[PDB]
Amino acid sequence: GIFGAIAGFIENGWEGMVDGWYGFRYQNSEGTGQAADLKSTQAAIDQINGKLNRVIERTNEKFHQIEKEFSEVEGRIQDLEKYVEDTKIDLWSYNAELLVALENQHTIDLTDAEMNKLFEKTRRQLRENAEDMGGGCFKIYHKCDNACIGSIRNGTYDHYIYRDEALNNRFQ
């Protein structure tokens, strides 16, 4: 993927995460946990639903047209009727092939980006209290219980409270 997160620096997806598309796994003083992140899940879902609505259920109404199958051999004008139909069909066939190729490329990329964004948002919250371990994991250098983890999931973690503790553990 173009953002390098999904099937990139994150090794694989989690089959046991059934209540969201993106989220967190953690280990702290209270055990080990999993939690879906709703905001990033909903952002991907909305985008995909937008794609779907634009493409799906908007057919044109057509009525009387030209003939398209023939019993008699005729020549010049039947040739034209067939070539006109054949030309139409190939052009729509191409439109359909391209549309799906472009959309799919874009869907894979937009979902990759959401993962990368969620990772970057976590890095920003944590400031100087964590280091990037790789594999999409942070080492948080301070005691961080389920409520602390909660504040990170909620976007209200306050790095300042833990900074002294964490700076101590990082550089000794």
Binding site: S29, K62, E67, L118, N169
Partner: protein, 321 residues
């Protein structure tokens, strides 16, 4: 304790599905939706559009008034359905540029016919044939009038009909091609007949060709069918000295959403806004692979039988080893 680990990730599913992209022919995503409609309900639904079963009648024969097509007399449709079992059961006939007449009528959507007071003085009207049985009697196309000699002679017919209406009139008329020379003189006195049909802006002239054609439903002669469209403000004129198959009136020409389709499918109650010869189809998807022939609110025909639209991220399941 003085540390914690926080890992970011995304979901994955047991059974993902392969899609196409710009760079990959097949790549697995978590979920997809099909954009190509490739299955049909199997029958034609008659609840959204007025679908008329033509049964054993072509649209043309029903227009002409072939005895066995009588009940189609004041019928209208959105879509007229032609069965491959249809058959003509009147005089053998042919229509130069048949396809165009069929198209014009099909498009109009109605078979509502209006009789007019054509006066054919000096000839007998309502000629019939053994080939065209009505009930038990020798008969003819209900919308056409076979004119022959009245006892003694067949005088030069000179008839006019104004179009004071505000729509185009469609007139159906023809000429009898006799199989022999005495048949010609028996019915029409003159040795060689003629029909001229004209308006202020158009003329059509047809000379019969006396002679034998292959035997069909008893007959060796033919009836050639022609048509004329008279515009508001104009006037129809019919000039003949024999062999005229006369018109009785006009069909009303409506610009409309009507058509005709060749199908052998069952016609029943259901809902669907898209009709194909294979039967109706839903129109939830933007494309279809059922048939290039369609009528109504329809997905576009494409050659591919399947096109998957990804509705999820790249699927990367946990290592199986």
């Amino acid at each position: 304790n003085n540390t914690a680990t926080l890992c970011l990730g995304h979901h994955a599913v047991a059974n993902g599905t392969l899609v196409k992209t710009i760079t990959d022919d097949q790549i697995e995503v978590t979920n997809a939706t099909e954009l190509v409609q490739s299955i049909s309900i199997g029958k034609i639904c008659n609840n959204s559009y007025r679908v008329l079963d033509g049964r054993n009648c072509t649209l043309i024969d029903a227009m002409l008034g072939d005895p066995h097509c009588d009940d189609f007399q004041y019928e209208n449709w959105d879509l007229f359905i032609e069965r491959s079992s249809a058959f003509s059961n009147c005089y053998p006939y042919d229509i130069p540029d048949y396809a165009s007449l069929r198209s014009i009528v099909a498009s109009s959507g109605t078979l509502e016919f209006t009789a007019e007071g054509f006066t054919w003085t000096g000839v007998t009207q309502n000629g019939g044939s053994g080939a065209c049985k009505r009930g038990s009697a020798d008969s003819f196309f209900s919308r056409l009038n076979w004119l022959t000699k009245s006892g003694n002679s067949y005088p030069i017919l000179n008839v006019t009909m104004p179009n004071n209406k505000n729509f185009d009139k469609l007139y159906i008329w023809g000429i009898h091609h006799p199989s022999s020379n005495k048949e010609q003189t028996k019915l029409y006195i003159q040795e060689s007949g003629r029909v001229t049909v004209s308006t202020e802006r158009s003329q059509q002239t047809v000379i019969p060709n006396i002679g034998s054609r292959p035997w069909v439903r008893g007959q060796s002669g033919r009836i050639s069918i022609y048509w004329t469209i008279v515009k508001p403000g104009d006037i129809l004129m019919i000039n003949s000295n024999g062999n005229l198959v006369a018109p009785r009136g006009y069909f009303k020409l409506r610009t409309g959403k009507s058509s005709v389709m060749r199908s052998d499918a069952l016609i029943d109650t259901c809902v669907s806004e898209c009709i194909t010869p294979n039967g109706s189809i839903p129109n939830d998807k933007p494309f279809q692979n059922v048939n290039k022939i369609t009528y109504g609110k329809c997905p576009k025909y494409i050659r591919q039988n399947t096109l998957k639209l990804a509705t999820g991220m790249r699927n990367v399941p946990e290592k199986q080893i």
